[PDB]
């Protein structure tokens, strides 16, 4: 009857209900409090990952209306842009195919 | 109860499917470069070697220009390799790879800066710290750099020596090398190029046999490979030049990059010190701290001599690599050292006076005692060539470091009963359950529970033995093994996945809370956000920054955890 | 197995031998018993490589017989079986020819995956806490 089977260490009360937590329960000792050394390490990690993103090599992006008045005039420009052309590239390190996009 | 809809939001079952390698690399490049770089890197990792037209055909972005810009950025950060090959039938098609060692600089950046700050011993002078920090930060954030570029990136009429004398000091310690085409060239492809041109210039129908010809090509290309590999790693001719009436100054034209191998060797030294601190006294390990730092500069390569990645291992002759590893690790004249050498570089704070009890001023007879202690320890911390001569046997110390870190991770996560059972089954071979009970002295029910909790990971293998022609599970007797390679393989993937998960969570938090970072950028976030009132906004900023710092700390600890398994 | 209880282990009594057998070896292999590791981490003092600081199987047998917490007869094979059982868990670093020492269990009784004993836990209802079974 497929319900006749039963192991020794198991009673009928324990079996008959499938319950898998699916949430983790055994942590790792690495999630204790912080240390001053790790704090300063995090600070320098924050400065990194930020300096590169604000740097030239971004390639990240994957109301600029047409009406013209004096507000557009003398408007403080938000940023001074940068391009791939600006940074000095050592030509040997790069293949010939990519020379067009960089400013020769 | 929790409904399946609530599961997909709270629990990370959506991310439990992603491949650990693709997840971590993609998250890293998305954090540091962006969405196009992540797209290209993900495509390279998922499919392998590709060309630009294939990249355009694969990624939704069909703008060759976008692909070319992404590839130049990824090359400047040397997260990619290239191999421009020519077909005999006609034109030449270049190809692109993903650089494991390039991404690991982003994965290790804070640790790299930490090591360069601490090893220069500039704790005395404040401005020296800022100078080396800025040098290393700019180098890592720019990919490659020149002394001319750095000197023109400073105000003129200043003391260029102050910002250039340490640069040569950086180059002299191995924390800075020049960059060449071998860094952007696949190692196995280079070995394939070198193996030929030695199997081709062989005389036609030579007296040497085909097996003899192949062996001749192997050992005649190994020498060229070794020369080309060792050239950029240790050739100080760039820093050896000296313009007239000047100090030792590096060549302006050469472009410098970070040397990941030196940092990896430093990390291995740190792991060895931290593991040694758990079997001997702090005084004994204090000497070990300076013994490892002295041989660090000339220490052998850590992950591989680049020769396992280069080819098929061998028919059976990885012994020709093991023997060479032993030969180098011993017969290196720098690596061999005596108890006299350690006297000079000994810390001033250390006393060594009462640390020793015999029968139960930095004197050389004190050092020899502790070095004999190190040699006597069960872990081969040191080995003696001749009485008075000393060296570190990496070929025998790395397996014990790996096994100890592994068993202590097991102890910290699963039960101490699990650690005892794992060590019991590992020390024994093919141990049955009755024998486990005999030589472990623990109740069989508990032993079975822990064995099951251990098989969920690749830690305990089952060896079936059938007694009938049809391998029934009723008539078979079940054994157990440990299979150290499978267990280390599983452990590194788990840690890699968890680092990927933490970085993804941090990016998600920043995505949700950028609405305050916008105002922070508006009002000069550093120190002024209090003046903008909005105490709720300040508290939200506070807890999100706390979460970020905790994420970075746990990431660094995970790095120290998976380092030893990343070794070989 | 004279230590069997209805043909089964008791663990409690087996632990009773283990808690005392370990203590003597630490007294044997350290200059001041256990008090050496109490004055301070920098006031620690250790043996010299030439002097023997280990212990043999027969010495342990006679000590446990003189103490007589065993209540039964213990053959050298029995004491060896117990020593092998407890030679795991880093207990009793084996020395050449049936000899033993203790190395880190001092700090065990009293970030590195080794000194995780002094690792406070999450103790929060926050996220980002890393688990060991999360991925699988």
Short mmCIF file of C-alpha atoms in Angstrom, two decimals, chain B residues 66-537:
data_model
loop_
_atom_site.label_atom_id
_atom_site.label_comp_id
_atom_site.label_asym_id
_atom_site.label_seq_id
_atom_site.Cartn_x
_atom_site.Cartn_y
_atom_site.Cartn_z
CA UNK B 66 30.23 50.14 -28.58
CA UNK B 67 31.98 46.76 -28.65
CA UNK B 68 35.28 48.37 -29.66
CA UNK B 69 35.05 50.93 -26.85
CA UNK B 70 34.17 48.21 -24.34
CA UNK B 71 37.10 46.11 -25.54
CA UNK B 72 39.61 48.97 -25.30
CA UNK B 73 38.42 49.75 -21.77
CA UNK B 74 38.58 46.07 -20.79
CA UNK B 75 42.08 45.81 -22.26
CA UNK B 76 43.30 48.90 -20.43
CA UNK B 77 42.09 47.25 -17.24
CA UNK B 78 43.65 44.03 -18.66
CA UNK B 79 40.53 42.02 -17.91
CA UNK B 80 40.85 40.55 -21.43
CA UNK B 81 43.50 38.86 -23.55
CA UNK B 82 43.86 38.85 -27.32
CA UNK B 83 45.35 36.46 -29.86
CA UNK B 84 45.70 37.90 -33.37
CA UNK B 85 46.09 34.80 -35.53
CA UNK B 86 46.36 34.49 -39.31
CA UNK B 87 44.69 31.84 -41.43
CA UNK B 88 46.85 30.30 -44.14
CA UNK B 89 43.90 30.31 -46.55
CA UNK B 90 43.61 34.10 -46.32
CA UNK B 91 42.92 37.00 -43.97
CA UNK B 92 43.62 37.15 -40.23
CA UNK B 93 40.98 37.15 -37.48
CA UNK B 94 41.80 38.33 -33.96
CA UNK B 95 40.24 36.74 -30.89
CA UNK B 96 39.53 37.73 -27.30
CA UNK B 97 39.65 36.03 -23.91
CA UNK B 98 38.71 36.78 -20.31
CA UNK B 99 41.65 37.41 -17.97
CA UNK B 100 41.31 35.62 -14.64
CA UNK B 101 44.21 37.57 -13.15
CA UNK B 102 42.90 40.91 -14.44
CA UNK B 103 39.56 40.67 -12.64
CA UNK B 104 41.26 39.42 -9.48
CA UNK B 105 42.88 42.85 -9.16
CA UNK B 106 39.40 44.34 -8.78
CA UNK B 107 38.55 41.48 -6.42
CA UNK B 108 41.69 42.20 -4.34
CA UNK B 109 42.18 45.97 -4.69
CA UNK B 110 41.87 47.01 -1.05
CA UNK B 111 44.08 44.16 0.09
CA UNK B 112 46.65 45.11 -2.57
CA UNK B 113 46.80 48.71 -1.36
CA UNK B 114 47.02 47.46 2.23
CA UNK B 115 50.02 45.27 1.42
CA UNK B 116 51.86 47.99 -0.50
CA UNK B 117 51.29 50.50 2.32
CA UNK B 118 52.47 48.10 5.03
CA UNK B 119 55.50 46.59 3.28
CA UNK B 120 57.22 49.87 2.42
CA UNK B 121 57.63 50.43 6.19
CA UNK B 122 56.58 54.05 5.79
CA UNK B 123 54.72 54.03 9.13
CA UNK B 124 57.36 56.52 10.33
CA UNK B 125 56.60 59.26 7.78
CA UNK B 126 53.03 60.37 7.15
CA UNK B 127 53.52 61.89 3.70
CA UNK B 128 55.24 58.72 2.50
CA UNK B 129 52.04 56.77 3.27
CA UNK B 130 49.89 59.17 1.26
CA UNK B 131 52.39 59.09 -1.59
CA UNK B 132 52.54 55.30 -1.93
CA UNK B 133 48.78 55.05 -1.45
CA UNK B 134 48.23 57.53 -4.28
CA UNK B 135 50.75 55.75 -6.53
CA UNK B 136 49.17 52.33 -6.11
CA UNK B 137 45.62 53.69 -6.28
CA UNK B 138 46.29 55.52 -9.54
CA UNK B 139 48.10 52.54 -11.06
CA UNK B 140 45.28 50.12 -10.26
CA UNK B 141 42.58 52.62 -11.28
CA UNK B 142 44.31 53.41 -14.59
CA UNK B 143 45.51 49.97 -15.67
CA UNK B 144 49.04 50.95 -16.67
CA UNK B 145 51.13 54.02 -15.94
CA UNK B 146 54.42 55.76 -16.68
CA UNK B 147 56.72 57.77 -14.44
CA UNK B 148 56.50 60.59 -16.99
CA UNK B 149 52.70 60.59 -16.76
CA UNK B 150 52.79 60.56 -12.96
CA UNK B 151 55.37 63.37 -12.82
CA UNK B 152 53.39 65.52 -15.25
CA UNK B 153 50.27 64.76 -13.17
CA UNK B 154 51.79 66.84 -10.34
CA UNK B 155 52.46 70.54 -9.84
CA UNK B 156 55.79 71.60 -11.31
CA UNK B 157 58.77 73.21 -9.55
CA UNK B 158 58.38 70.63 -6.77
CA UNK B 159 60.59 67.83 -5.41
CA UNK B 160 60.03 65.18 -8.07
CA UNK B 161 62.55 63.02 -6.21
CA UNK B 162 60.18 62.70 -3.25
CA UNK B 163 57.53 61.28 -5.61
CA UNK B 164 59.98 59.28 -7.74
CA UNK B 165 62.52 57.88 -5.28
CA UNK B 166 59.86 55.63 -3.75
CA UNK B 167 58.70 54.64 -7.24
CA UNK B 168 62.05 52.98 -7.87
CA UNK B 169 61.78 51.60 -4.34
CA UNK B 170 58.45 50.13 -5.40
CA UNK B 171 59.99 48.61 -8.54
CA UNK B 172 62.90 47.12 -6.56
CA UNK B 173 60.62 45.14 -4.21
CA UNK B 174 58.63 43.40 -6.96
CA UNK B 175 55.38 45.32 -6.38
CA UNK B 176 55.67 46.83 -9.87
CA UNK B 177 56.70 45.37 -13.24
CA UNK B 178 56.62 46.50 -16.83
CA UNK B 179 53.81 45.23 -19.05
CA UNK B 180 54.36 43.33 -22.29
CA UNK B 181 52.46 41.25 -24.83
CA UNK B 182 52.94 38.08 -22.78
CA UNK B 183 50.47 39.46 -20.24
CA UNK B 184 47.78 39.74 -22.93
CA UNK B 185 48.63 36.40 -24.56
CA UNK B 186 47.11 33.04 -23.55
CA UNK B 187 49.63 30.77 -21.87
CA UNK B 188 48.50 27.56 -23.57
CA UNK B 189 48.49 29.29 -26.96
CA UNK B 190 52.01 30.56 -26.30
CA UNK B 191 53.06 27.02 -25.39
CA UNK B 192 51.46 25.72 -28.59
CA UNK B 193 53.39 28.32 -30.60
CA UNK B 194 56.66 27.42 -28.86
CA UNK B 195 56.19 23.63 -29.05
CA UNK B 196 56.03 24.01 -32.81
CA UNK B 197 59.00 25.69 -34.52
CA UNK B 198 60.91 23.11 -32.49
CA UNK B 199 59.03 20.13 -33.94
CA UNK B 200 59.25 21.78 -37.39
CA UNK B 201 62.94 22.67 -37.77
CA UNK B 202 63.74 18.99 -37.15
CA UNK B 203 65.59 17.37 -40.10
CA UNK B 204 63.40 15.35 -42.44
CA UNK B 205 63.58 11.59 -41.76
CA UNK B 206 66.07 12.28 -38.98
CA UNK B 207 67.60 9.30 -37.12
CA UNK B 208 65.66 10.43 -34.04
CA UNK B 209 62.32 8.66 -33.69
CA UNK B 210 58.88 10.28 -33.54
CA UNK B 211 58.69 9.84 -29.77
CA UNK B 212 62.26 11.13 -29.59
CA UNK B 213 61.33 14.07 -31.84
CA UNK B 214 58.37 15.01 -29.64
CA UNK B 215 60.46 14.77 -26.47
CA UNK B 216 63.22 16.83 -28.10
CA UNK B 217 60.70 19.51 -29.04
CA UNK B 218 59.28 19.49 -25.50
CA UNK B 219 62.60 20.03 -23.74
CA UNK B 220 63.80 22.49 -26.39
CA UNK B 221 60.69 24.66 -26.06
CA UNK B 222 60.63 24.48 -22.25
CA UNK B 223 63.83 26.54 -22.12
CA UNK B 224 62.44 29.27 -24.38
CA UNK B 225 59.19 29.29 -22.40
CA UNK B 226 61.12 29.68 -19.15
CA UNK B 227 63.20 32.53 -20.59
CA UNK B 228 60.16 34.41 -21.90
CA UNK B 229 58.23 33.89 -18.65
CA UNK B 230 61.07 34.95 -16.35
CA UNK B 231 62.04 38.00 -18.45
CA UNK B 232 59.37 40.50 -17.26
CA UNK B 233 59.07 39.08 -13.74
CA UNK B 234 62.67 39.71 -12.59
CA UNK B 235 64.80 41.89 -14.88
CA UNK B 236 65.73 45.09 -13.07
CA UNK B 237 67.51 46.63 -16.06
CA UNK B 238 64.79 49.28 -16.32
CA UNK B 239 65.57 50.49 -12.80
CA UNK B 240 69.30 49.77 -13.11
CA UNK B 241 69.87 52.62 -15.58
CA UNK B 242 71.02 55.91 -14.11
CA UNK B 243 71.07 59.31 -15.84
CA UNK B 244 74.08 61.47 -15.05
CA UNK B 245 74.22 63.47 -11.78
CA UNK B 246 71.02 61.66 -10.78
CA UNK B 247 69.88 58.83 -8.54
CA UNK B 248 68.80 55.33 -9.57
CA UNK B 249 65.82 56.24 -11.77
CA UNK B 250 63.62 53.95 -13.86
CA UNK B 251 63.37 54.34 -17.63
CA UNK B 252 60.72 56.94 -18.60
CA UNK B 253 59.33 55.06 -21.61
CA UNK B 254 58.54 51.76 -19.88
CA UNK B 255 54.95 51.36 -18.70
CA UNK B 256 54.38 49.73 -15.32
CA UNK B 257 51.62 47.53 -13.90
CA UNK B 258 50.94 45.65 -10.68
CA UNK B 259 52.62 42.28 -10.14
CA UNK B 260 49.87 39.97 -8.93
CA UNK B 261 52.29 37.08 -8.35
CA UNK B 262 54.27 38.98 -5.70
CA UNK B 263 51.05 39.87 -3.87
CA UNK B 264 49.91 36.24 -4.01
CA UNK B 265 53.23 35.14 -2.53
CA UNK B 266 52.77 37.69 0.24
CA UNK B 267 49.31 36.28 0.91
CA UNK B 268 50.78 32.78 1.18
CA UNK B 269 53.33 34.12 3.66
CA UNK B 270 50.51 35.64 5.73
CA UNK B 271 48.56 32.37 5.72
CA UNK B 272 51.66 30.45 6.79
CA UNK B 273 52.29 32.84 9.69
CA UNK B 274 48.68 32.65 10.85
CA UNK B 275 48.69 28.84 10.70
CA UNK B 276 52.05 28.68 12.51
CA UNK B 277 50.66 30.82 15.34
CA UNK B 278 48.49 27.79 16.20
CA UNK B 279 51.21 25.21 16.90
CA UNK B 280 54.09 27.08 18.62
CA UNK B 281 54.65 30.10 20.82
CA UNK B 282 54.25 33.71 19.80
CA UNK B 283 58.00 34.17 20.26
CA UNK B 284 58.78 31.29 17.89
CA UNK B 285 56.23 32.53 15.35
CA UNK B 286 57.64 36.06 15.70
CA UNK B 287 60.88 34.81 14.13
CA UNK B 288 58.88 32.90 11.51
CA UNK B 289 57.23 36.23 10.67
CA UNK B 290 60.57 37.68 9.54
CA UNK B 291 61.92 34.42 8.09
CA UNK B 292 59.03 34.31 5.61
CA UNK B 293 59.34 38.00 4.73
CA UNK B 294 63.04 37.63 3.89
CA UNK B 295 62.55 34.82 1.36
CA UNK B 296 59.31 36.33 0.04
CA UNK B 297 60.91 38.36 -2.77
CA UNK B 298 62.62 35.29 -4.27
CA UNK B 299 59.89 32.82 -3.36
CA UNK B 300 58.67 30.43 -6.09
CA UNK B 301 55.52 31.16 -8.05
CA UNK B 302 52.43 30.30 -6.06
CA UNK B 303 49.46 29.25 -8.18
CA UNK B 304 51.51 27.53 -10.89
CA UNK B 305 54.78 27.96 -12.82
CA UNK B 306 52.33 28.62 -15.68
CA UNK B 307 53.26 25.18 -17.04
CA UNK B 308 50.20 23.22 -15.90
CA UNK B 309 47.94 25.60 -17.83
CA UNK B 310 50.27 25.38 -20.81
CA UNK B 311 49.57 21.88 -22.04
CA UNK B 312 48.39 18.41 -21.26
CA UNK B 313 49.79 17.56 -17.84
CA UNK B 314 51.79 14.60 -19.16
CA UNK B 315 51.34 10.91 -19.88
CA UNK B 316 52.37 10.21 -16.29
CA UNK B 317 55.18 12.75 -15.85
CA UNK B 318 53.96 15.52 -13.60
CA UNK B 319 56.80 14.06 -11.53
CA UNK B 320 59.00 16.17 -13.80
CA UNK B 321 57.23 19.20 -12.31
CA UNK B 322 57.20 17.96 -8.71
CA UNK B 323 60.93 17.20 -8.77
CA UNK B 324 61.72 20.59 -10.31
CA UNK B 325 59.59 22.28 -7.65
CA UNK B 326 61.57 20.56 -4.91
CA UNK B 327 64.85 21.35 -6.68
CA UNK B 328 64.06 25.06 -6.96
CA UNK B 329 62.59 25.40 -3.46
CA UNK B 330 65.77 23.94 -1.97
CA UNK B 331 68.66 24.80 -4.31
CA UNK B 332 67.72 28.47 -4.56
CA UNK B 333 70.69 30.30 -2.94
CA UNK B 334 68.47 33.08 -1.61
CA UNK B 335 65.96 30.56 -0.27
CA UNK B 336 68.62 28.72 1.73
CA UNK B 337 69.43 30.57 4.95
CA UNK B 338 71.14 30.06 8.30
CA UNK B 339 70.54 31.15 11.89
CA UNK B 340 73.08 33.96 11.46
CA UNK B 341 71.02 35.80 8.82
CA UNK B 342 67.94 36.15 11.02
CA UNK B 343 69.88 38.09 13.67
CA UNK B 344 70.17 41.36 11.73
CA UNK B 345 66.54 41.70 10.58
CA UNK B 346 65.13 40.61 13.95
CA UNK B 347 62.60 43.07 15.42
CA UNK B 348 63.97 45.57 17.91
CA UNK B 349 61.01 45.02 20.26
CA UNK B 350 61.64 41.28 20.57
CA UNK B 351 63.82 40.14 23.47
CA UNK B 352 64.06 36.31 23.21
CA UNK B 353 65.49 36.32 26.75
CA UNK B 354 63.23 34.15 28.90
CA UNK B 355 61.22 32.53 26.10
CA UNK B 356 63.11 29.23 26.45
CA UNK B 357 63.50 26.68 29.23
CA UNK B 358 66.54 24.49 28.65
CA UNK B 359 66.21 21.38 30.86
CA UNK B 360 62.85 20.25 32.21
CA UNK B 361 70.83 40.16 23.20
CA UNK B 362 69.46 38.81 19.89
CA UNK B 363 72.04 36.03 20.24
CA UNK B 364 72.33 33.59 17.35
CA UNK B 365 72.09 30.71 19.83
CA UNK B 366 68.56 31.90 20.66
CA UNK B 367 67.44 31.85 17.02
CA UNK B 368 68.72 28.32 16.40
CA UNK B 369 66.60 27.07 19.31
CA UNK B 370 63.36 28.39 17.83
CA UNK B 371 64.28 27.25 14.32
CA UNK B 372 64.88 23.76 15.70
CA UNK B 373 61.46 24.09 17.35
CA UNK B 374 59.98 24.97 13.96
CA UNK B 375 61.65 21.96 12.35
CA UNK B 376 60.52 19.69 15.20
CA UNK B 377 56.88 20.76 14.85
CA UNK B 378 54.55 18.28 13.18
CA UNK B 379 53.89 20.77 10.40
CA UNK B 380 56.99 21.03 8.18
CA UNK B 381 57.34 24.76 8.81
CA UNK B 382 61.08 24.59 8.08
CA UNK B 383 63.52 21.95 6.88
CA UNK B 384 67.30 21.79 7.19
CA UNK B 385 69.64 21.26 4.26
CA UNK B 386 72.65 20.85 6.55
CA UNK B 387 72.87 21.41 10.32
CA UNK B 388 72.60 25.19 10.55
CA UNK B 389 70.99 25.60 7.11
CA UNK B 390 67.27 26.23 6.73
CA UNK B 391 64.56 26.44 4.07
CA UNK B 392 60.77 26.31 3.79
CA UNK B 393 59.41 23.17 2.02
CA UNK B 394 56.44 24.60 0.12
CA UNK B 395 55.96 21.32 -1.74
CA UNK B 396 55.01 19.67 1.58
CA UNK B 397 53.58 22.62 3.56
CA UNK B 398 50.80 23.65 1.16
CA UNK B 399 48.85 20.35 1.41
CA UNK B 400 48.89 20.56 5.21
CA UNK B 401 47.85 24.21 5.14
CA UNK B 402 44.95 23.35 2.84
CA UNK B 403 43.84 20.36 4.91
CA UNK B 404 44.02 22.30 8.19
CA UNK B 405 42.05 25.28 6.87
CA UNK B 406 39.51 22.87 5.38
CA UNK B 407 39.00 20.90 8.58
CA UNK B 408 38.70 24.09 10.62
CA UNK B 409 36.05 25.47 8.25
CA UNK B 410 34.25 22.16 8.79
CA UNK B 411 34.62 22.56 12.55
CA UNK B 412 33.29 26.12 12.51
CA UNK B 413 30.26 25.28 10.35
CA UNK B 414 29.28 21.66 11.04
CA UNK B 415 29.88 19.81 14.29
CA UNK B 416 33.10 19.08 16.12
CA UNK B 417 31.84 15.53 15.83
CA UNK B 418 31.89 16.14 12.08
CA UNK B 419 35.49 17.35 12.26
CA UNK B 420 36.50 14.28 14.27
CA UNK B 421 34.72 11.94 11.85
CA UNK B 422 36.24 13.66 8.80
CA UNK B 423 39.75 13.40 10.24
CA UNK B 424 39.09 9.79 11.25
CA UNK B 425 37.96 8.75 7.78
CA UNK B 426 40.77 10.74 6.13
CA UNK B 427 43.51 9.26 8.33
CA UNK B 428 42.00 5.83 7.82
CA UNK B 429 41.30 4.46 4.34
CA UNK B 430 37.99 2.99 3.15
CA UNK B 431 36.61 2.65 6.67
CA UNK B 432 33.36 0.77 7.30
CA UNK B 433 30.75 1.87 9.83
CA UNK B 434 31.56 -0.77 12.45
CA UNK B 435 35.22 0.25 12.30
CA UNK B 436 34.19 3.91 12.52
CA UNK B 437 32.43 3.04 15.76
CA UNK B 438 35.51 1.13 16.92
CA UNK B 439 38.12 3.85 16.27
CA UNK B 440 35.95 6.92 16.90
CA UNK B 441 34.03 6.03 20.10
CA UNK B 442 30.78 7.83 19.30
CA UNK B 443 27.20 6.59 19.17
CA UNK B 444 26.22 5.14 15.81
CA UNK B 445 23.06 7.28 15.53
CA UNK B 446 25.05 10.50 15.97
CA UNK B 447 27.77 9.21 13.64
CA UNK B 448 25.17 8.54 10.94
CA UNK B 449 23.53 11.94 11.37
CA UNK B 450 26.86 13.74 11.01
CA UNK B 451 27.88 11.54 8.07
CA UNK B 452 24.68 12.52 6.26
CA UNK B 453 25.25 16.20 7.06
CA UNK B 454 28.76 15.78 5.63
CA UNK B 455 27.76 14.05 2.38
CA UNK B 456 25.61 17.05 1.39
CA UNK B 457 28.98 18.58 0.48
CA UNK B 458 31.69 16.80 -1.45
CA UNK B 459 33.37 15.78 1.82
CA UNK B 460 32.52 12.10 2.40
CA UNK B 461 32.20 9.79 -0.58
CA UNK B 462 30.33 6.47 -0.52
CA UNK B 463 31.96 3.35 -1.97
CA UNK B 464 29.31 0.74 -2.70
CA UNK B 465 30.15 -2.96 -2.59
CA UNK B 466 27.50 -5.24 -4.15
CA UNK B 467 26.98 -8.88 -3.24
CA UNK B 468 24.47 -9.68 -6.02
CA UNK B 469 24.62 -9.33 -9.79
CA UNK B 470 21.91 -6.66 -9.61
CA UNK B 471 23.35 -3.94 -7.38
CA UNK B 472 20.55 -3.92 -4.81
CA UNK B 473 20.80 -1.52 -1.88
CA UNK B 474 19.70 -4.27 0.53
CA UNK B 475 22.46 -6.79 -0.18
CA UNK B 476 25.30 -4.27 -0.53
CA UNK B 477 27.78 -3.11 2.12
CA UNK B 478 28.65 0.58 2.08
CA UNK B 479 32.12 2.05 2.70
CA UNK B 480 33.37 5.63 2.92
CA UNK B 481 36.26 7.75 1.63
CA UNK B 482 37.25 11.41 1.70
CA UNK B 483 38.64 12.30 -1.77
CA UNK B 484 40.46 15.50 -0.86
CA UNK B 485 40.33 16.89 -4.41
CA UNK B 486 36.52 16.80 -4.62
CA UNK B 487 36.21 18.42 -1.19
CA UNK B 488 38.55 21.29 -2.00
CA UNK B 489 36.82 21.71 -5.37
CA UNK B 490 33.43 22.13 -3.72
CA UNK B 491 34.77 24.44 -1.00
CA UNK B 492 36.22 27.04 -3.38
CA UNK B 493 33.07 27.20 -5.52
CA UNK B 494 30.90 27.75 -2.44
CA UNK B 495 33.05 30.64 -1.23
CA UNK B 496 33.21 32.15 -4.71
CA UNK B 497 29.42 32.01 -4.95
CA UNK B 498 29.03 33.64 -1.56
CA UNK B 499 31.37 36.49 -2.49
CA UNK B 500 29.33 36.99 -5.66
CA UNK B 501 26.14 37.04 -3.59
CA UNK B 502 27.51 39.64 -1.17
CA UNK B 503 28.64 41.95 -3.98
CA UNK B 504 25.26 41.59 -5.69
CA UNK B 505 23.47 42.47 -2.46
CA UNK B 506 25.62 45.57 -2.02
CA UNK B 507 24.87 46.71 -5.56
CA UNK B 508 21.15 46.16 -4.98
CA UNK B 509 21.25 48.26 -1.80
CA UNK B 510 23.04 51.11 -3.57
CA UNK B 511 20.51 50.88 -6.41
CA UNK B 512 17.61 51.25 -3.99
CA UNK B 513 19.22 54.06 -1.97
CA UNK B 514 20.89 56.23 -4.63
CA UNK B 515 18.03 58.72 -4.12
CA UNK B 516 19.91 60.06 -1.09
CA UNK B 517 23.36 59.87 -2.68
CA UNK B 518 22.03 62.31 -5.28
CA UNK B 519 21.39 64.91 -2.57
CA UNK B 520 24.73 63.95 -1.01
CA UNK B 521 26.47 64.87 -4.26
CA UNK B 522 24.40 68.06 -4.34
CA UNK B 523 25.43 69.16 -0.84
CA UNK B 524 29.02 67.88 -0.54
CA UNK B 525 28.30 64.66 1.36
CA UNK B 526 31.53 64.72 3.40
CA UNK B 527 30.68 66.29 6.75
CA UNK B 528 27.87 68.63 5.65
CA UNK B 529 24.84 66.32 5.42
CA UNK B 530 23.96 67.13 9.04
CA UNK B 531 23.39 70.78 8.09
CA UNK B 532 20.74 69.76 5.53
CA UNK B 533 18.39 68.63 8.36
CA UNK B 534 16.39 65.52 7.28
CA UNK B 535 17.36 63.35 10.28
CA UNK B 536 15.57 60.41 8.68
CA UNK B 537 17.77 60.88 5.61
#
